[PDB]
Design a protein around this nucleic acid. Structure first.
Ligand SMILES: [Mg+2]
Ligand SMILES: [Mg+2]
Ligand SMILES: [Mg+2]
Ligand SMILES: [Mg+2]
Ligand SMILES: [Mg+2]
Ligand SMILES: [Mg+2]
Ligand SMILES: [Mg+2]
Ligand SMILES: [Mg+2]
Ligand SMILES: [Mg+2]
Ligand SMILES: [Mg+2]
Ligand SMILES: [Mg+2]
Ligand SMILES: [Mg+2]
Ligand SMILES: [Mg+2]
Ligand SMILES: [Mg+2]
Ligand SMILES: [Mg+2]
Ligand SMILES: [Mg+2]
Ligand SMILES: [Mg+2]
Ligand SMILES: [Mg+2]
Ligand SMILES: [Mg+2]
Ligand SMILES: [Mg+2]
Ligand SMILES: [Mg+2]
Ligand SMILES: [Mg+2]
Ligand SMILES: [Mg+2]
Ligand SMILES: [Mg+2]
Lengths: 227, 72, 122, 242, 77, 46
RNA sequence: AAUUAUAUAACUUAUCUAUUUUAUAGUAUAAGUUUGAAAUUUCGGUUGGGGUGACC
RNA sequence: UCUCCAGGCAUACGCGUAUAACAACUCGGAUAACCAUUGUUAGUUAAUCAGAAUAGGCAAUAAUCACACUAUAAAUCACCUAUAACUUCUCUGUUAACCCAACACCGGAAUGCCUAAAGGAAAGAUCCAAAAAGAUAAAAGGAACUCGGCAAACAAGAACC
RNA sequence: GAGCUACCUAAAAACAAUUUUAUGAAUCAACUCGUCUAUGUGGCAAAAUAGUGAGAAGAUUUUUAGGUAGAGGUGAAAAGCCU
């Protein structure tokens, strides 16, 4: 009888009502522990393909205007409503975004290095080595999946041929095609890790239930005696 | 029509009036006019249950005739 | 602790539970939560004029009851259809195609009163 | 009390009464007859007698077919009589070890097969045994046509056979139209399998399908008794004139 | 590019057609004559149904492009 | 606390948990009905 | 503890595919090897209370 | 009429005639009177209380007297474009001292209004024993009690492991 | 079999007065719980009564409907709870 709430097909900026799980599945059994209750939250559909040219428009660099930088219940980072043409869409906001700012979204792969302005989306080929990036996408056109948490920045270590090495926030090095799109700068809420929950009740507000109260090398035969 | 219900019996089904044909009516289609294989064991049990009732009735008649002829 | 043997009726259960007592519907509930009664859906009693009628509820005990002969299709056919066909056969003006001339109905569709499926109440 | 007939005869009794009795005689023969399929999962005994090695005496031997489970999915394919063997094994292959549940599964493949009589390519789930059997039969059409119901072991396989047989029986010009010479060649190649049109209709049908078919054949609206009595009246009147 | 609407919530894909339909020249035996579904017979294919008259309570609108006032040029309201 | 009052009547729960439609929804439930029919129960379900 | 252990997870060889000049990759299955989620079964006898040593 | 007591009236869920009158005095109420019992007859009345056309486009801006403010846990069809239809009141709930606890059970039981204008009766009659239970009062003393200031107190303060 | 109980999902509800650095703060009702004592021990009760006590804007309490089922479920682990 469990139907997922993720049943909306059309992108909108209207907040969407979310149903909580509690850690259960469609079967109805707990699959993950520590999830329950919390404050009621609304989902704001984020757009992780920064370079999405508007409908009935050419695939060339375009600009968008930042309406407001909001607080997101569903994320550690903060989101920004950005407007361009006749379209509004939520996006992830970088460290220094402000209302009224203008951000570029470019398809052009610069033969030479492109000056890096935080918040603008360029193909990794355009960027020069060493520039901090966020909201990287593993495959061209896939959509951002990495470095989209609060304060996380990835360095662009190297570019050779049509491939670049991206150092993920965990220091795990990844490689992608330079056609892949990344957003310059680190993600907002750079001080998210400095927060102090302070009391147990605050965690219960965040939908986190308390942990359970419950409290292996095998020697080889030569070593079994000497264990 | 003569139809088999989900319990394995044969019953006369009275039709109803509808504004749409049967294949487009979702309420009607949810009704089942067939029995699955798990019903055959119950079908035999009814036959045997009924056969016992008939056997007892016939025996009792024969016993009752004895009383009549003995009495008269 | 519930009663399993008594009938399920609208008096029982919560307020949300409702069901009919067998009265035929006389209208439709449209959108906006409005009842719209349909004049055609409301049964109309066809009552005859009883002035000058000689039949009363009871009969004389001296009135002889007749031999019971339930009406059959053959009995109806002989009384109504047989004389016409017999007369026409003697004159020779009879053919299979024109059975409708004697009162046959090829189909019940288009009739106000259909014999099968019946479309009128008693 | 007791039932008049043993339980194993109950199916035969039903086929002998009711709408089942009205089914064609040839169709009932297929239902009535029980024939064992060709061995697949066990080696048959070559002889009817062998010498028991211990006592050195001639002993009668019999073939006991292994019980095989045929999943409902197999009815959508052309498995070559293969099925699932649900059984047990002895761990380490010694009688004194544990008895363990074991299921032996056939290796299934999806292949494209072309039927000349139907001139259509089907995608079918198949085993290597079926491909070998088709090779032995010299074509997909021959395999379907030659193989009996028991060995074919597929409702889809039986359905294909009905189509081929009906196509041959009618000499339908729908096969390769505009090339009457090619149509004739195909029909001639498979001429051995031609049977009467009536028989081909009922090939491969299940009992439920047959009953529905027979019900449709005999379905009729009742005759208005007005017509019936008129016919009786006309005949009597006509006879009187004679 | 992320697609909105998880597949589990979408209308389920139609069940595949019975293989008897694939066979040319063969008329499948279906439960149409019965006037009810049965698990062991072929599923009928019904032609689109037309009531033969207009029912206001169950009116169905035409698509946008078939509307009389459909115009190529957008009008911002 | 005092026990014995575990029945907290609710007609919606009763018909949904033990009703006709609930019993016919699964083959196991249909077999429940068949058993009660063979015994001769006056009440097949709630 | 003894017996098992297509729960997973790896591998190897077949099988089946593609390619390949023999190589690669894969894999509706079969047979092995490694892990063990589990399963099944048992708690000999003499020894104040034990511990221990012993004994049959 | 008097004496005294202080959760009452509605709705929801549930219950299913326990409702009311008459007649009975077998059974039921743990006894009578009287009926909650038996039999017969009656009852609960609603357009406002309560239950029960289609296809498109589209949304940044809590609540808290919402103003000032502050905040964080980030918080509820409409409107528009077209299409279609072009005057209607039937059906169902409505009684009660009632439900879940085997009982006319010192128990359990949601919300709104109100705190006596509503709702009720702790004593069948008599007697004034022991033991037992509860309440109040205490000469002198004030923890000498007891495993322990348990319980009670005109006390209800301080401090340390 | 989750109308009890354990946990969860959806939709709802309740919190007076008094102080406060403005809150899993304080005092104390309604409400929730159940510290200690006496009574009761076939009891009013198959866990209650009478006092005395703990929390009482929160990790609070409570209502309606739904969910997870025994080789299992749930568990702020008592091997506690699942009529
Ligand atoms: Mg711990
Ligand atoms: Mg009980
Ligand atoms: Mg409850
Ligand atoms: Mg009286
Ligand atoms: Mg008495
Ligand atoms: Mg009364
Ligand atoms: Mg009475
Ligand atoms: Mg009333
Ligand atoms: Mg009790
Ligand atoms: Mg009063
Ligand atoms: Mg007294
Ligand atoms: Mg005192
Ligand atoms: Mg004193
Ligand atoms: Mg002392
Ligand atoms: Mg002393
Ligand atoms: Mg004390
Ligand atoms: Mg519940
Ligand atoms: Mg308050
Ligand atoms: Mg507090
Ligand atoms: Mg306190
Ligand atoms: Mg305190
Ligand atoms: Mg808990
Ligand atoms: Mg412990
Ligand atoms: Mg312990």
């Amino acid at each position: 009888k469990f139907v997922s709430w993720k049943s909306r097909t059309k992108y909108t900026v209207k907040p969407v009502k979310m149903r909580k799980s509690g850690g259960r599945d469609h079967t109805g059994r707990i699959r993950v522990h520590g999830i329950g209750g919390g404050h009621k939250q609304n989902y704001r559909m984020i757009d992780f393909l920064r370079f999405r040219p508007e409908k009935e428009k050419a695939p060339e660099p375009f600009e968008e205007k930042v309406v407001v930088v909001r607080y997101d219940p569903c994320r550690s980072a903060d989101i920004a409503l950005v407007a361009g043409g006749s379209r509004k869409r939520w996006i992830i906001a970088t460290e220094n975004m402000k209302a009224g700012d203008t951000i570029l979204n470019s398809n052009h792969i610069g033969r030479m290095a492109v000056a890096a302005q935080e918040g603008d989306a360029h193909p990794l080929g355009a960027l020069p080595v060493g520039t901090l990036i966020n909201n990287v996408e593993s495959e061209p056109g896939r959509g951002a999946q990495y470095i989209r948490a609060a304060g996380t920045c990835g360095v662009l270590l190297r570019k050779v041929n049509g491939t670049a090495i991206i150092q993920l926030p965990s220091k795990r090095q990844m490689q992608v095609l330079e056609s892949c799109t990344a957003t310059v700068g680190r993600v907002s809420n750079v001080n998210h890790n400095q927060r102090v929950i302070g009391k147990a009740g605050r965690n219960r507000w965040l939908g986190k239930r308390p942990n359970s109260g419950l409290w292996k090398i095998r020697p080889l035969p030569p070593m079994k005696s000497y264990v | 029509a003569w139809r088999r219900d989900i319990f394995g019996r044969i019953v006369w089904h009275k039709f109803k009036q509808w504004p749409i044909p049967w294949y487009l009516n979702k309420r009607y289609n949810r009704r089942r006019f067939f029995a699955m294989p798990y019903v055959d064991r119950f079908i035999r049990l009814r036959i045997e249950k009924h056969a016992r009732i008939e056997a007892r009735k016939r025996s009792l008649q024969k016993k009752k005739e004895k009383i009549l002829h003995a009495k008269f | 602790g519930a009663d399993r043997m008594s009938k399920w009726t609208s008096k029982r259960g919560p307020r949300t539970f409702t069901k009919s007592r067998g009265a035929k519907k006389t209208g439709i509930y449209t959108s906006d939560r409005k009842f719209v009664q349909i004049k055609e859906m409301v049964p109309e009693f066809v009552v005859p004029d009883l002035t000058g009628f000689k039949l009363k509820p009871y009969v004389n005990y001296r009135a002889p009851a007749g031999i019971d002969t339930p009406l059959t299709a053959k009995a109806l056919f002989q009384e109504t259809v047989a004389p016409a066909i017999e007369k026409d056969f003697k004159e020779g003006t009879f053919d299979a195609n024109n059975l409708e001339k004697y009162g046959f109905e090829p189909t019940q569709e288009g009739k106000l009163f259909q014999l099968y499926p019946k479309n009128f109440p008693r | 009390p007791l039932h008049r007939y043993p339980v194993h005869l109950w199916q035969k009794l039903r086929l002998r009464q009711g709408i089942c009795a009205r089914l064609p005689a040839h169709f009932l023969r297929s239902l009535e007859e029980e024939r064992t399929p060709t061995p697949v999962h066990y080696k048959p005994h070559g002889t009817k007698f062998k010498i028991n090695p211990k006592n050195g005496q001639r002993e009668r031997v019999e073939d006991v077919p292994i019980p095989v489970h045929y999943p409902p999915e197999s009815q959508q394919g052309l498995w070559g009589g293969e099925g699932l063997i649900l059984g047990y094994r002895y761990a380490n292959n010694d009688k004194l070890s544990k008895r363990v549940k074991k299921v032996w599964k056939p290796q299934l493949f999806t292949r494209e097969l072309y039927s000349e009589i139907l001139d259509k390519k089907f995608t079918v789930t198949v085993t290597m045994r079926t491909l070998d059997l088709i090779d032995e039969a010299y074509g997909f059409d021959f395999y379907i046509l030659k193989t009996p119901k028991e060995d074919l072991g597929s409702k889809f396989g039986m359905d294909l056979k009905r189509g081929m047989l009906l196509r041959l029986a009618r000499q339908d010009p729908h096969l390769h139209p505009e090339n009457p010479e090619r149509r004739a060649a195909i029909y001639d190649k498979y001429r051995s399998f031609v049977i009467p049109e009536a028989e081909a209709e009922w090939v491969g049908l299940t009992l439920e399908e047959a009953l529905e078919k027979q019900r449709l054949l005999e379905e009729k609206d009742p005759v208005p008794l007005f017509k019936v009595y008129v016919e009786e009246l006309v005949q009597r009147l006509q006879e009187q004139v004679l | 590019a992320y697609e909105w609407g998880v597949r589990s919530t979408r209308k389920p894909e139609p069940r595949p057609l019975d293989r008897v339909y694939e066979i040319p020249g063969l008329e499948p035996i279906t439960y149409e004559g019965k006037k009810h579904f049965v698990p062991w017979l072929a599923r009928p294919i019904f032609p689109p149904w037309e009531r033969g008259w207009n029912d206001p309570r169950f009116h169905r609108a035409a698509p946008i492009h078939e509307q009389t006032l459909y115009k190529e040029e957008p009008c911002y309201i | 606390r005092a026990r014995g009052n575990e029945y907290q009547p609710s007609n919606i729960k009763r018909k949904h948990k033990h009703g006709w439609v609930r019993r016919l929804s699964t083959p196991a439930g249909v077999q429940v009905i068949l058993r009660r029919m063979l015994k001769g129960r006056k009440s097949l379900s709630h």
